[PDB]
Amino acid sequence: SVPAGAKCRLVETLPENMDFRSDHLTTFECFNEIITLAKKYIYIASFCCNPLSTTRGALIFDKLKEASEKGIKIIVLLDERGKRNLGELQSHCPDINFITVNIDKKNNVGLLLGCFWVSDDERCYVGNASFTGGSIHTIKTLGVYSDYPPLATDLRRRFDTFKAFNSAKNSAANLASAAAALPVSTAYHIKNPIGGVFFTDSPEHLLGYSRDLDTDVVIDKLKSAKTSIDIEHLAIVPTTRVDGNSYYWPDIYNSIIEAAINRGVKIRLLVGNWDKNDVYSMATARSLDALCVQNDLSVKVFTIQNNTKLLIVDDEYVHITSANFDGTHYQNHGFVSFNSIDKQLVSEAKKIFERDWVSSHSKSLKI
Amino acid sequence: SVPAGAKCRLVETLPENMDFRSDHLTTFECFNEIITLAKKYIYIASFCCNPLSTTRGALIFDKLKEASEKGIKIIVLLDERGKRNLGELQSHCPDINFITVNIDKKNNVGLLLGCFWVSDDERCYVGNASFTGGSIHTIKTLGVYSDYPPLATDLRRRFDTFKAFNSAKNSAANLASAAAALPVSTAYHIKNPIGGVFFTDSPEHLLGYSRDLDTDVVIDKLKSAKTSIDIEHLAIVPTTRVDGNSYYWPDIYNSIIEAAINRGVKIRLLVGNWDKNDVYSMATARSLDALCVQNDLSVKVFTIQNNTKLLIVDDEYVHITSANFDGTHYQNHGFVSFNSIDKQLVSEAKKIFERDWVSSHSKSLKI
């Protein structure tokens, strides 16, 4: 049979200077385990790659450096905009293969997020802790780890799609005929989950014909919410700035308010504090402030470095990703989102949100 | 051949105590002409019916009373919620047939708006001037009049659909099998306009298979706007109160902001002033106020009694209706909207908006 939850356990970074505590597997423990048990390969994919920025990040880099010297095939995918450190990285690990990726050479907007590890088609991490010293040590993150080969193998398929967009000669990023020849495969989706777990994907032009668009799955779960919606993202503003122009995209923003007003859903938003100079953030905040008075919407803000992207619906479905709920991300950026309906794993994430909601780093919205 | 504009001319009510002036046909002149030229029937449909509230309204009622005594079939459709005056009306005109309509006996939300006259399948008025003394004399209204039989006959078909929902025995309002036996017919729509003119309809459950849903046509024109969007409605708030519960519906509200931000459309909103106690109106205003600073959105408010429901896009398409751009209306209420792409008639409406925009009764939004 298949184990419930697909051997998934929560993984988070809780910096020393922050009051967050838990018994979960730490990001440092997780990355150290993946390298220690590796026998074949270690595939890593995140936007930026800068392990040497903190103490624990540099230790992870040494263990990874030692693995590549022992004969482990190690590939690190980073977006071509996180290319500044590439010289520093290769000089430290000449045996690790670093690959810069541009998933959107047509419009130069789509960024590689992914944010996952996978090794030997057995172990994997999915979350919002990039392969940077900050995400490993000093920045609050949240992710999932599983030693279930059927699940990790499905995540490795996401790595095959991103690696195809290398900035090297006639590949899937430079030739459209080679991008159409990509078997963009998945084994589990919302229609066929594994132990109550499945991955959703983005953007739509890399989705293929079998994968689930994360945009569709998230909005569906928001609109299907019957009781509660808990979200811990960076921002829920319906307007973001791509290039140098503002981009309006209220798709996620609407489905949340639709739940609060039309369906009476209790909603708690734990977002980052906004710029007093950004009129789009000020206006969105004053709109949310008025909805708290009339409906059951609650908003708290944080100012710490926090990459947590968490969504919980009805204490029945959990969504952990590396992208933020806005138009820039869900229309262009390439990432993998963790989805689970296992009540037990969902209960552990609900405990995480409850802790963060009452943390000292979470103050109630005031305008 | 067919005349351009379909013999359509603008009709508006400009009360004495207001600075609005024009050379157009007045609502009082228009209703007086329809009655004077009538030889067969005069069909009237509006929410409320109260002609005796003003001097000019009572004169219209006398001319209509005289027509019914001369052998003209006169039917007045009013919603069952405007039934208070029914005793006063029938005692004054025993020969006029008054019919109370309930288009939504399932949920008791949908109201009859329509707001049009039609006579002899030759003449007709469409607009926002109800058959009340206020709309004829003391309230600013805007409408269209045409003596083109092919257009007026298509409007009479809208009257056949509403009359079927009388509150009398087994009819289309009380039997679902008789409501399905309704030939909900139209001759002209956006795909087949007459002289650049066509009617759109609402709600969707009375639309039939051939008519255009006003919701779809309006949003399409908003999203297709390339340069300008001028709107003079009562409110553009994405939240309205049906029954005793708030209803969130940002479909129209979004497509406007989408034009201003994503497409740089110059937009001017002339809406009514809001309640300082309504948090949904206060929040929507403060959101619009921030969009005026960053984009080309402009908002002015009025406090006079004004039923004007006007939309102009790119100086190329005009939309005049009796419903307000909100969820309560475009999801439940039954009305007829005037649509014209005749550049000449559109230019006359653009002159109307320009006058209203700089009127003394239009002050710039301040919060």
Question: In chain B, which residues have their Cβ closer than 8 Å to the Cβ of A258?
Answer: 248
Which of A250, A254, A290 comes nearest B283 by C-beta?
A290
User: What is the phi-psi region of residue A264: left when phi exceeds 0, alpha when psi lies from -120 to 50, beta otherwise?
Assistant: left
Residue B168 CA, chain-centre distance (Å), reads 26
User: What are the tokens at B244?
Assistant: 């005793």
List, in order of start, the domains of chain A with CATH numbers: 4-364 (3.30.870.10)
A202 three-state secondary structure: strand
Question: In chain A, which residues have their Cβ closer than 8 Å to the Cβ of B222?
Answer: none
Which of A283, A289, A294 comes nearest B290 by C-beta?
A283
Only one residue has tokens 């650049």, namely B196
Which of A247, A280, A290 comes nearest B279 by C-beta?
A290
Residue type at A113 in one-letter notation: L
User: What is the phi-psi region of residue B82: left when phi exceeds 0, alpha when psi lies from -120 to 50, beta otherwise?
Assistant: alpha
- Please judge whether B261 and A246 are an interchain contact, meaning their C-beta atoms are less than 8 angstroms apart: yes
Given CB atoms, is B248 within the 8 Å cutoff of chain A? yes
Question: In chain B, which residues have their Cβ closer than 8 Å to the Cβ of A295?
Answer: 246
Only one residue has tokens 């996180």, namely A82
Question: In chain B, which residues have their Cβ closer than 8 Å to the Cβ of A293?
Answer: 279
Distance, in Å, from the CA atom of A28 to the CA atom of A60, rounded to the nearest integer, reads 7
Distance, in Å, from the CA atom of A135 to the CA atom of A12, rounded to the nearest integer, reads 9
**Best mutation site among A246, A253, A276, A282 for testing chain B: the one with the most B CBs within 10 Å?**
A246
Residue type at A241 in one-letter notation: R
- Establish how many alpha carbons lie within 13 A of residue A162's alpha carbon, considering only the half-sphere containing its beta carbon: 34
Residue A112 makes CB contacts below 8 A (sequence gap 6+) with A45, A46, A47, A77, A78, A79, A101, A102, A103, A162, A165, A333, A334
Given CB atoms, is A149 within the 8 Å cutoff of chain B? no
CB-CB contact of B303 with A310 (8 Å): no
User: What are the tokens at A286?
Assistant: 């004053």
Question: In chain B, which residues have their Cβ closer than 8 Å to the Cβ of A286?
Answer: 283, 286-287
Distance, in Å, from the CA atom of A306 to the CA atom of B225, rounded to the nearest integer, reads 40
CB-CB contact of A124 with A146 (8 Å): yes
Distance, in Å, from the CA atom of B135 to the CA atom of B50, rounded to the nearest integer, reads 10
Cross-strand pairs, A229: A267, A313
Given CB atoms, is B240 within the 8 Å cutoff of chain A? no
Report the b/e string of A245-266 with b at 16+ CB within 10 A.
ebbbbbbbbbbbbbbbbbeebe
Sheet order of strands, A8-13 included: A25-26, A8-13, A141-146, A123-127, A116-119, A41-45, A73-79, A97-101
Write out the H or E segment, with its range, that includes residue A338. strand A334-340
Distance, in Å, from the CA atom of B90 to the CA atom of A206, rounded to the nearest integer, reads 68
Which of B250, B284, B290 comes nearest A279 by C-beta?
B290
Distance, in Å, from the CA atom of B284 to the CA atom of B297, rounded to the nearest integer, reads 14
Distance, in Å, from the CA atom of B320 to the CA atom of B310, rounded to the nearest integer, reads 5
Output the DSSP codes for B281-303: HHHHHHHHHHHHHHSSEEEEEE-
Which residue is closest to B292 within chain A, CA to CA? A279
Distance, in Å, from the CA atom of A205 to the CA atom of A109, rounded to the nearest integer, reads 13
Question: In chain A, which residues have their Cβ closer than 8 Å to the Cβ of B291?
Answer: 283
* 3-state SS track over chain B: CCCHHHHEEEEEECCCCCCCCCCCEEHHHHHHHHHHHCCCEEEEECCCEEHHHCHHHHHHHHHHHHHHHCCCEEEEEEEHHHCCCHHHHHHHCCCCEEEEECCCCCCCCCCEEECEEEECCCEEEEECCCEEHHHHHHCEEEEEEECCHHHHHHHHHHHHHHHCCECCCCCCCCCHHHHHCCCCCCCCECCECECCEEEEEECHHHCCCCCCEHHHHHHHHHHCCCCEEEEECCCCCCEEEECCEEEECCHHHHHHHHHHHHCCCEEEEEEECCCCCCHHHHHHHHHHHHHHHHCCEEEEEECCCECCCEEEECCCEEEECCCCCCHHHHHHCEEEEEEECCHHHHHHHHHHHHHHHCCCCCEECCC
Only one residue has tokens 């806005």, namely A326
Given CB atoms, is B277 within the 8 Å cutoff of chain A? no
Residue A236 CA, chain-centre distance (Å), reads 15
Distance, in Å, from the CA atom of A330 to the CA atom of A323, rounded to the nearest integer, reads 8
- Please judge whether A280 and B287 are an interchain contact, meaning their C-beta atoms are less than 8 angstroms apart: no
Given CB atoms, is B62 within the 8 Å cutoff of chain A? no
Size of interface A-B (CB pairs under 8 A): 56
Which of A248, A261, A293 comes nearest B257 by C-beta?
A248
- Please judge whether A279 and B258 are an interchain contact, meaning their C-beta atoms are less than 8 angstroms apart: no
Q: How far is A338 from chain B (nearest CA, A)?
A: 30
Question: In chain A, which residues have their Cβ closer than 8 Å to the Cβ of B280?
Answer: 290, 294
**Best mutation site among B245, B247, B294 for testing chain A: the one with the most A CBs within 10 Å?**
B294
A316 three-state secondary structure: coil
Q: Angle, to 10 degrees, between the axis of helix B279-294 and the axis of helix B251-262?
A: 20
Cross-strand pairs, B271: B301
Which of B239, B257, B290 comes nearest A261 by C-beta?
B239
* 3-state SS track over B240-277: EEECCEEEECCHHHHHHHHHHHHCCCEEEEEEECCCCC
Q: How far is B262 from chain A (nearest CA, A)?
A: 6
- Please judge whether B280 and A294 are an interchain contact, meaning their C-beta atoms are less than 8 angstroms apart: yes
Distance, in Å, from the CA atom of B293 to the CA atom of A320, rounded to the nearest integer, reads 36
Distances (CA, A) of A334 to A132, A174, A212, A250: 18, 17, 13, 20
Which of B257, B279, B295 comes nearest A294 by C-beta?
B279
CB atoms inside a 10 Å sphere around CB A100? 20
User: What are the tokens at A140?
Assistant: 């609050």
User: What are the tokens at B245?
Assistant: 């519960």
The technique is X-ray
A141-146 and A123-127 as β-strands: parallel, antiparallel, unpaired? Answer: antiparallel
Binding-face residues of A in 282-301 toward B, CB within 8 A: 282-284, 286-287, 289-291, 293-295
Given CB atoms, is A257 within the 8 Å cutoff of chain B? yes
CB-CB contact of A137 with A58 (8 Å): no
Residue type at A65 in one-letter notation: K
